[PDB]
């Protein structure tokens, strides 16, 4: 389960979103449609928008373990 | 472990922990509960250690005794090596990457060190208990006791001010905790110094009872307040098990050292794992037919980790470092550089581009350098807090307020944000200034009595939230008046969402916690069946299905997709570690082909081939096409698209500058050139094109309100308080629309069952049981759609034409059969890439990080695009400088085509417009311009929005690529 206090930084993440579900169902729901969010695998696309995304907004925002780079496996 | 809300498993032993002070620098002031030996007092009560009290009992042999509760340990990885005698150096160092120094003839720990930036510095007093705590150098924490050894108050040593009042009782333990927030939680024990009841400060109080007597007794029977969290846990010799308040027992067995050895589940899944007599993990069994296997050299450190028909990773350490090569199985492989003072230097990972790290005489990092720019730059004061910050050349600048948070921040263009704080934490307010004394996008936000989020106030309106007592959003207030509540079950699940229209979505879980079944507001059903492993395999729509099945190593090989008509049969290839290359359907039979160092240099689609080339620093540079045209792009400093070059010679190149934000500013040919100007925020505001002229100007409520042009033009909008748009007037008419502020008509021609529309001007629908528009009955036109069992459009017919379209194995359309011919089209990843409709080949040119297109090439020729901030093609002109296309578009985005010399069939954003249906499509879907709204529903219908079938708030400042 879920006990912990949530802070402004995770209401401010969730209320810029426009799903209204919490993230536990949101995940399931992304993972049981996998038919639809299917792409290609280890092709550097040039977009920036997947296609489990969507709608955005026109508006830019440049709001502000670090330090390093995972580079591919940190057991 | 842990399974319990804070219990063990291998023993009865209740453990809780809970923090007091969170600070933004990085401090943290723990304290665990320890339910096992809890007879000794440590001055914070019976069985209570503030974790910041270590203790080794003697100089070497007795143990170092953590707060959670040479001499080699191979076990355990102790490195306690003595230093000078007189001063007792132990410097603990165990395998946790951490270093517990502790001294003699002073009784004390100093110097723990919790990585290469973290360090804590102790000060004692002149009795054996601490009074000073130092992250660095400067005080930070001071205690205060009561004259009996009890530590009560937490002082800030900066500002006189109380942080955490402990609370005892006559019986030498804490009853209260009154931690920094200011939330009291109590603390009732029993009479043999065991935990009996904890009541939360919200009021939610769990319980506890125990088995056993003394130290070694037994928690079972944890149940909450009102049945919340009901666990039972039965203990049997060296096997456990545990139910929680669904029926859902796991069981356990474990070893005598206190390794796991098996663990069960309710449905069948079955996980056992094998050690090899050191304390090490050996073989791990999944409940599906694989065995991974560990293999250790000397000092072990996992060199080889192979799994069942697979490969694997083989990790690599040069003596005692950090990982110094990664193999990584595939065709690539990695590496870096470690020496004897950290800070990690010289990265080369697959590609190029290596990774050089600067430092300063302190430890922190100063400079992040790499190829072809991306150079990260940062200052540093007196003191550890961050002032100057520069990633891609913008260098920020962050005043502070003689606190460590930040105050101001100070922008390259001019821009200045100033945050406000109060006696505590959890900012309130936040502002933006600019050259000019103006107030623009200032959000605040209360709290209520606790410390959550009650209600956040923005320029378009405020929100409201509503806890149930368990920091749960019970119910959420929109500002418009409406509200929408949630409603849980046991173990704090999501069952169901009502709102204000009456209709309520419903879920459905399974004895395993997963979602197994949906009803939406006009009602479905579904059923999501799982494999042992957590994979959904049946779909089982209520008509139709989809059949995954997977290739026993983790990724998707088949989709049996179909209602028994129009079978889909989608098949796929994936290797050991992603590397698809392959989809193959009835119709299309994609592949691809990569290079050694791994790139996707050749690409096959059908009979057509793309191929590409890519730099030493992974750009790709001298891009081929088929029909033998090849294209030039050049880069610059920062790493940025500034230049393309064509091929021919008789097609000149284009030139773009950026600002000093990072973004698009000016875009330049030989016979033109695109001004963009913003006002400061982030919006686009005017716009040029050495002939035509464009300005924005808005509201209060952050929204387009006006649109001047030269040519004419001067458009007024007018929405609600929501968004919507309401009226709206362009040179002599003002259309007028309206909502039910959930984006459905409530005019006067609407008719709606649950969430989609029957009537709309004269225009009626019908829908299947699926929800997708099948018949549409006009004033005298009549048109049938048929669809494919994966909700995408197969055949429309019905308006004296008949049109059939085929897509790939991937949901992009590749061929569309009509009467005017057979149309071909070329797809680049998720971008529409050119087309091919028996006359020649088109190529669709679009910014290097957006779907606005700026030129398109035809037989030898080359047209630029004019658009405005939304991304719509407005005009079109060759390189002589004469209209060639242009058109002028609705509210709702009908095209009404002026000029017609060349076609164009962009749209808003990736959409492509139909001739013979009059619809747009862009990846997955289908749009209606005379109608405003989708004719099907998408697979992401309850995560991407309340209604299924709307497109967006307005489509004036909102957009929606890649169909959902």
């Given amino acids: 389960c879920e006990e912990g206090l949530k802070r402004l930084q995770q209401m401010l993440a969730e209320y810029q979103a426009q799903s209204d579900v919490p993230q536990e169902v949101c995940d399931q729901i992304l993972e049981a449609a996998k038919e639809s969010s299917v792409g290609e695998d280890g092709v550097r696309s040039q977009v920036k928008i997947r296609k489990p995304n969507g709608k955005n907004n026109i508006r830019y925002e440049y709001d502000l373990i670090t330090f390093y780079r995972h580079i591919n496996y940190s057991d | 472990e842990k399974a319990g809300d804070p219990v063990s498993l291998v023993t009865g032993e209740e453990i809780l922990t809970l923090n007091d002070v969170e600070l933004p620098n990085g401090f943290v002031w723990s304290r665990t509960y320890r339910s096992s030996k809890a007879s000794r007092n440590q001055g914070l009560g019976y069985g209570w250690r503030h974790a910041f009290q270590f203790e080794l009992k003697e100089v070497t042999d007795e143990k170092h005794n953590v707060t959670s509760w040479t001499s080699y340990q191979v076990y355990v990885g102790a490195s306690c090596h003595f230093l000078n005698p007189n001063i007792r150096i132990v410097t603990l160092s165990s395998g946790d990457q951490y270093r517990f120094e502790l001294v003699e003839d002073i009784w004390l720990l100093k110097q723990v060190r919790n990585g290469i930036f973290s360090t804590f510095q102790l000060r004692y007093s002149r009795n054996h208990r601490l009074i000073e705590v130092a992250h660095n150098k400067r005080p930070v924490l001071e205690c205060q006791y009561d004259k009996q050894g009890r530590l009560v108050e937490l002082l800030n040593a900066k500002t006189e001010q109380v942080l955490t009042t402990y609370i005892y009782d006559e019986q030498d333990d804490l009853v209260g905790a009154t931690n920094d927030l200011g939330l009291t939680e109590r603390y009732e024990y029993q009479d043999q110094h065991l935990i009996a009841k904890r009541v939360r400060p919200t009021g939610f109080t769990h319980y506890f009872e125990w088995s056993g007597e003394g130290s070694s007794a037994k928690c079972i029977r944890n149940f909450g307040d009102s049945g919340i969290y009901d666990y039972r846990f039965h203990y049997e010799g060296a096997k456990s098990s545990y139910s929680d308040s669904l029926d859902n027992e796991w069981t356990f067995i474990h070893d005598e050292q206190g390794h796991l050895l098996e663990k069960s589940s309710p449905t069948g899944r079955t996980w056992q794992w094998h050690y090899d007599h050191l304390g090490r993990k050996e073989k791990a069994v999944f409940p599906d037919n694989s065995t991974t296997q560990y293999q250790y050299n000397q000092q072990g450190q996992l060199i080889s980790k192979l799994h069942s028909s697979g490969a694997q990773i083989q990790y690599g350490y040069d003596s005692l470092g950090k990982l110094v090569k990664t193999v990584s199985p595939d065709g690539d492989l990695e590496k870096a550089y470690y020496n004897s003072l950290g800070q990690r230097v010289w990265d080369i990972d697959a590609l190029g581009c290596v990774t050089e790290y600067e430092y300063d005489k302190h430890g922190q990092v100063v400079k992040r350098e790499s190829e072809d720019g991306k150079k990260s730059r940062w200052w540093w004061d007196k003191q550890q807090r961050l002032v100057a910050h520069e990633v891609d050349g913008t260098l920020l600048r962050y005043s502070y307020g003689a606190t460590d948070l930040v105050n101001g921040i100070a922008y390259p263009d001019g821009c200045v944000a100033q945050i406000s704080y109060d006696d505590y934490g959890r900012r309130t307010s936040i502002r933006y200034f600019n050259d000019e004394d103006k107030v623009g996008y200032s959000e605040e936000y209360a709290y209520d009595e606790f410390s959550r989020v009650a209600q956040i106030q923005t320029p378009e309106g405020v929100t409201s939230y509503q806890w149930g007592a368990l920091a749960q959003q019970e119910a959420v207030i929109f500002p418009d008046g409406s509200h929408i509540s949630y409603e849980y079950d046991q173990q704090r699940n999501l069952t169901k969402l009502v709102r204000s229209d009456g209709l309520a979505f419903e879920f459905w879980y399974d004895s395993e916690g997963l979602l197994s079944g949906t009803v939406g507001f006009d009602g479905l059903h579904s059923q999501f069946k799982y494999d042992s492993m957590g994979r959904i395999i049946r779909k089982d729509v209520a008509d139709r299905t989809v059949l995954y099945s997977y290739d026993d190593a983790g990724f998707l090989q088949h989709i049996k997709a179909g209602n028994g008509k129009n079978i889909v049969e989608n ?94 500013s000016v875009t330049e040919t030989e016979s033109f050139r695109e001004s963009k100007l913003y006002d400061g925020v982030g919006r686009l505001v005017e716009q040029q094109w050495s002939g035509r002229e464009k300005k924005y100007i808005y509201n209060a409520q952050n929204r387009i309100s006006s649109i001047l042009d030269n040519t004419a033009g001067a458009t007024h909008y007018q929405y609600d308080t929501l968004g919507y748009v309401t009226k709206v007037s362009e040179a002599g008419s003002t259309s007028t629309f309206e909502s039910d502020s959930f984006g459905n008509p ?185 109608l405003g709204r989708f004719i099907q529903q998408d697979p992401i219908s309850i995560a991407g929005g309340i209604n299924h079938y709307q497109y967006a708030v307005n489509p004036i400042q909102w957009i929606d690529p890649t169909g959902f």
Avoid at chain 2, 628 to 656: H, Q, V
Wanted: glycine share 8%; aromatic share 14%.
């Fill in chain 2, 746 to 930: 409530a005019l006067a021609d609407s008719k709606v069952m649950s969430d989609r529309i029957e009537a709309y001007a004269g225009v009626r629908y019908k829908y299947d049981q699926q929800g997708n528009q099948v018949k549409r009955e006009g004033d005298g036109t009549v048109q049938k759609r048929v669809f494919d069992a994966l909700s995408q459009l197969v055949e429309v017919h019905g308006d004296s034409s008949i049109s059939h379209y085929e897509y790939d194995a991937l949901g992009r359309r590749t061929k569309k059969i009509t009467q005017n011919g057979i149309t071909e089209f070329l797809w680049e990843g998720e971008r529409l890439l050119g087309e091919r409709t028996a006359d020649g080949f088109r190529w669709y040119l679009y910014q290097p990080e957006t779907y606005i297109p700026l030129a398109v090439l035809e037989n030898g020729s080359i047209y630029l695009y004019e658009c405005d901030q939304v991304g719509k093609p407005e005009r079109l002109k060759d390189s002589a400088g004469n209209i060639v296309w242009s058109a002028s578009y609705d509210v709702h985005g009908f095209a009404s085509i002026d000029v017609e010399e060349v076609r164009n069939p962009l749209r808003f954003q990736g959409q492509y417009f139909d001739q013979e249906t009059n619809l747009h499509y862009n990846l997955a879907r289908y749009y209606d311009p005379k």
């Fill in chain 2, 571 to 664: 098949h796929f290839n994936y290797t050991l570690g992603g590397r698809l290359t392959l989809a193959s359907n009835r119709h299309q039979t994609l592949q691809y082909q990569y290079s050694s160092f791994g790139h996707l240099t050749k690409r096959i689609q059908g009979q057509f081939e793309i191929g590409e080339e890519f730099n030493r620093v992974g750009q790709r540079v001298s891009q081929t096409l088929p029909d033998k045209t090849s294209f030039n792009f050049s880069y610059d400093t920062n790493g940025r698209l500034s230049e393309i070059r064509f091929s021919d010679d008789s097609l000149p190149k284009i030139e773009f500058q950026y600002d000093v934000m990072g973004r698009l």
